[PDB]
Amino acid sequence: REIVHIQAGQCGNQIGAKFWEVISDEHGIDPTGSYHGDSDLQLERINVYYNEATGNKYVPRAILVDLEPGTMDSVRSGPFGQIFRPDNFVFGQSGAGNNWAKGHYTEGAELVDSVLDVVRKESESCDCLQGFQLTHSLGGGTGSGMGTLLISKIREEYPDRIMNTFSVMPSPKVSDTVVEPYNATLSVHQLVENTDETYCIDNEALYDICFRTLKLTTPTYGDLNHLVSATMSGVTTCLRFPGQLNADLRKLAVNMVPFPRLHFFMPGFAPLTSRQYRALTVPELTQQMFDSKNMMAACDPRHGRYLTVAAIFRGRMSMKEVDEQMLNVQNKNSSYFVEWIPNNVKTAVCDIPPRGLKMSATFIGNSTAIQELFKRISEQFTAMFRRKAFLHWYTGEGMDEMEFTEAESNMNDLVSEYQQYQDA
Amino acid sequence: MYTFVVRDENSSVYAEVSRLLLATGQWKRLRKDNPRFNLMLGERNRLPFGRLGHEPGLVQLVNYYRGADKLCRKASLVKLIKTSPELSESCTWFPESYVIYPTNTDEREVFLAAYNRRREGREGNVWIAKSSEGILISSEASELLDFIDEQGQVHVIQKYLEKPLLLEPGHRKFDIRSWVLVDHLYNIYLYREGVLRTSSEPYNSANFQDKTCHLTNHCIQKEYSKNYGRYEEGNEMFFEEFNQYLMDALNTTLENSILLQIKHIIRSCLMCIEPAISTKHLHYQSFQLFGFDFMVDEELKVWLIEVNGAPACAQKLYAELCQGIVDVAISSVFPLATSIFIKLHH
Amino acid sequence: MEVIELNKCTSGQSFEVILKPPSDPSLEEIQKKLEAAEERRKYQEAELLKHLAE
Amino acid sequence: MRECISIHVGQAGVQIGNACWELYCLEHGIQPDGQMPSDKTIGGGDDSFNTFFSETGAGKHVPRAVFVDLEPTVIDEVRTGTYRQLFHPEQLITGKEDAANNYARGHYTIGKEIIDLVLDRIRKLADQCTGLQGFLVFHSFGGGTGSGFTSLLMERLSVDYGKKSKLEFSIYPAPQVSTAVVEPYNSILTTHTTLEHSDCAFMVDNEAIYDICRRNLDIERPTYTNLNRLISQIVSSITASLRFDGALNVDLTEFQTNLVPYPRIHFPLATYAPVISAEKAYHEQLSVAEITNACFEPANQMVKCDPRHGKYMACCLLYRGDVVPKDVNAAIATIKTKRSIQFVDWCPTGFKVGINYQPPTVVPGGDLAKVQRAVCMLSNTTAIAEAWARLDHKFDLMYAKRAFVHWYVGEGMEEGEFSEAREDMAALEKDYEEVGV
Ligand SMILES: Nc1nc2c(ncn2[C@@H]2O[C@H](COP(=O)(O)OP(=O)(O)OP(=O)(O)O)[C@@H](O)[C@H]2O)c(=O)[nH]1
Ligand SMILES: Nc1nc2c(ncn2[C@@H]2O[C@H](COP(=O)(O)OP(=O)(O)O)[C@@H](O)[C@H]2O)c(=O)[nH]1
Ligand SMILES: COc1ccc(N(C)c2nc(Cl)nc3cccnc23)cc1
Ligand SMILES: [Ca+2]
Ligand SMILES: [Cl-]
Ligand SMILES: [Mg+2]
């Protein structure tokens, strides 16, 4: 039933805040936590994400984590800032310097116990906690290094819950430092072992979407996060809205992940929106959500095969038309769906549309083309690592080159494992 | 755009159908095991009918009629003709036949009761034996059953046709292949073109151990026959030449002396089994191409011998016939963006 | 085709129509299976926790 | 009079049980509170309807039913629904978290912790029974609870009630309404483990019910509600002989006796007619001959398959409404001439016939029109093996890659249970083929 949400680092907290704004709006809750919507679909499952507090108040079940206070302060001062319980703000002062080792081994270790204290308090107030979701980037230090520290600590203390992450992948087109491939590779190694399901949110894909199709010449992090929050509302709709399919994080893992390690999902969204007036037809929605241009991980789906797919349609529309169009996509492109998982495409419908859209579609694919993502990272890793460039930032925190070799090998193994099933 | 799947690579007719379908740009072929097909060109053995028609959003069609084997394997067809009121043991266009099982219900104890009346009545008592290579045409039974039991599968033995119609010049035998296409609506379509598979060796009514002037198989004639092809290229006389012959030599048409009987026999057989195999109200649909093998006697009486459920065509007619299958069996169900078949109905 | 065993009453009748004549483990073993699976589960959990202790 | 206890397991079992018990109440004139006026014997009786309802001193008729689900959301709707007063709280059993579509999670992990509670509640029902004859068990093949907990419960019922009969109503999985990609796995696993504990099993393929709803009820996108009201009609047609006066299929033993000569082949095919839309303005009412004949169209079967290319081992015709024997025999005579109906050589070619003069009750506001006569045919034909073929193929496609197996092994199941189950199914398919070709 209940989900415990954790946002770590600058990126993790900025996209986390946007997510809570968006779904708080969808469920009728206002910045003070007071429900003010009209329908009752909005409250049936409101407890999957919110706690109820004195005076009919709704408090997100969310822990905010950072090693520097800047972005946390920015959240408290932001739109929905005061809807979170102040005791769930857990921060240090020294930052992590975009350094995985500082997040995972030195600065982060110093802070991680008190985060786990807040996690414990939130979970013992749960009737049947189903698991955790973490928002973070992989390119910085706190989100990647200390978020993966958190994940393996949470797994140690709660080995029977689901661990789900929204993980933002670095891209040179949207790059803070040159060490992002290092941080990303180290984190992927962690994720491949300690999450059940990871949404790969590629800052490359987000940039290309803002640039090539939303016609934004100078994309900001805000333009990127508008896409991310649309996708996040989309992929959690079947978790937080009563539908025919009464979904949870474990059923999603069971049905989407045919082999433990291949749990890295390509998300997609349609229609692609910028921060319009023409209503989309269900055939259009369906063609767009499957379009490479609507996917948030910069991969060509035609370069691999779909293991599984989950698809969510939001709005009032023809269930019959949806079925027909989904079947048409599969029957007209069956080449790209593995034939050894029968009926590997499942669809769900929710009547409630997202804000500002009469209809939308969200896509969750487990495709072997995700290997392209990891190949990208791996190339950027090796280019530096073969000259041991920038390693001193990491050896100075106690890390050894051997650990870089191990994470690189494990990521390359992940790539080979995807390639194994692209050809079965 | 339509999808098909090919599960019998060793079929000449459906190889040509695959090519014709691709050449339309509106059909793409999938891997043999991909279940999201509109069309299945099935394997000849143990075709999985039970898996057809359970794919939502796909109208599914297959090139075989489940159950049509009762017509198309020799013991089955004899049992069907004898036991079915529509055809009856009094059937006038099927030779006397009996189902015999090897040494290792049967019908040899009912056979002998008739064979000895044939031998006493001093009638021609030649009988032929075969199953579904290993043929024996003999004059006395103890050769027949003796041979049957050296093999080990069920056999049928039936009254050999002692007075066939012989083509001159040459004094030779022949069989008539008719091709018939039953579509998913159970329209019965007879192809305009038949073929006469002839023998190249005048008919020697003496010793029935020489199978070269008594069996008309295109195979046994190319290899073991003296002058394979002296009278017609490949030992195959088509319908125009044969009608011409019937007019010149015998003063009749092919249509009147023979084809009327052939259309009657075809329609009778297929209408008889229609309730057992029709896909009219089924979750998947069937069509099928049949080869009816006919033998004409010296009185211009037609006889049915085998129905083959997976026949090949004559190289001359592949193109036209396969294009007809596409037109009436496949595009009728899956449309694209002066007919060569005669429709049998009465 | 003959009609037999006709039985009838105010809510309805029943009868037969012939057209042609004719031509476990114990509670012990179960709780053992359940507990064997629990043991495999506990072992996998201990493997995981040891790896995390490393 | 001998009692029958109904057991509904998982979402599919519980929502179908709701449908059936609503229907039952309407048919026997039992009000939503549990009061049946026509019941002059207050506080007890050995009437026919008493095999499914017990009575309280206050004249409340209470289903001999247990609802069990591993999460609470579906049974909570029973607890707050129209028929809340009907059921006594101890009968509605719920867990905290479901089986996650995972047979092994329902059988081993979560099953082991609630099995004894369920058996205790079932015993409290059985202790109110003078002569219990056994159990009717509703469940999906595809759900994790439906498959995994159901098989555990069946094993334990064979232990604690060895001489009692056990009947299944089982929802076979269909992609158009399915909720999980691993439903073939769960189906094979629960069938293998349950085969020897079930005396007779009625399979409903959601594909067939879905298409019946679309073609004959003109429902464009059927819901679980549409499907379940149609299924509950079929189920009521099957159990009417246990709830009413008659001489056919009066106890559970008679189901096996009349429908299952070989004990492993215990999956009778159900065919039902007529299904007529309530929105049909002008309907011409169908004769005995028309509805009986419709019992041989695959489009009316609970499982799409072709009985022409199989053999029959038994055949029962259950009519409801204005039907008399001679019109039945007249319809059979003609049908026999126009249809391919082959019995196995060691069985008589014949039909056991049951007529109940009360025509089908229909749910007010539902999708089904009232009709003057209806029939349900129960025939044990080898053709139903087609469905096993389909399932065993889907299974084989995933298992050849071991896709998803790790989710089952991680619950304590051994990989070998997969191939064991699949081997049992291969045996079943061969039994069918040798009995029928
Ligand atoms: N006919 C019908 N089928 C249903 C219904 N509910 C679920 N199903 C089918 O049952 C299968 C899913 O299993 P469920 O019964 O819902 O799952 P469960 O038994 O509750 O087990 P869990 O995995 O723990 O949730 C799918 O094939 C569904 O389409 C229903 O109300 N009617
Ligand atoms: N999409 C997105 N990416 C971000 C955002 N903020 C930072 N990033 C990316 O995250 C990486 C830097 O990590 P960051 O979160 O800033 O460091 P941290 O505070 O140590 O966890 C780089 O790849 C940045 O492009 C954001 O708001 N949105
Ligand atoms: C391809 O096979 C499946 C079968 C089920 C599922 N489930 C559990 C889902 N779970 C959640 Cl949270 N959202 C969804 C949104 C759309 C469709 N399905 C789901 C996913 C894939
Ligand atoms: Ca009473
Ligand atoms: Cl007992
Ligand atoms: Mg930063």
Ligand SMILES: [Mg+2]
């Ligand atoms: Mg459930």
